Design a protein around this ligand. Sequence first.
Ligand SMILES: [Cl-]
Length: 177
Amino acid sequence: DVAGAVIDGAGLGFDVLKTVLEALGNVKRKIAVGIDNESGKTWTAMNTYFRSGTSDIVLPHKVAHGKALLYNGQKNRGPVATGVVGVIAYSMSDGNTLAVLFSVPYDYNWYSNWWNVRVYKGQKRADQRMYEELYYHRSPFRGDNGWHSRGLGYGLKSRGFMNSSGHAILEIHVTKA
Ligand SMILES: [Cl-]
């Protein structure tokens, strides 16, 4: 149950994400991401785009139906007052893209955690334009310690949760609508 592995879907929960957080160690901002695939079809990694921060982790390459992927990121190291903000992209078996946004800021006096999920038509790599779409235009969910559910179209829906603090967990389930 490490970032970069897939686990039986049922196994994904807050604790496994906490384990992922902890293995990152003493850094100011960071995220553990778990996405559970009940789409009915296989996901293959495309790429992650970072607006800010990094990960030393290779996105799990294949995520079969019934598996969950484990991933992480963290702020750029050293004296930069910045967080960890990015977009993950997976290609699905139907030829479309599953896109996930995470945003953990540095300054909670002025900013909050956000996340989002959307299915794009075709093969689309994560990039800055996708960032701006998911963040400014496609109604992102606040990391407000609450669950949020939404239809993805394409026969699918999303359910996920993200906390509100600088050590973020983000738990997403993709299921048949
Ligand atoms: Cl904000």
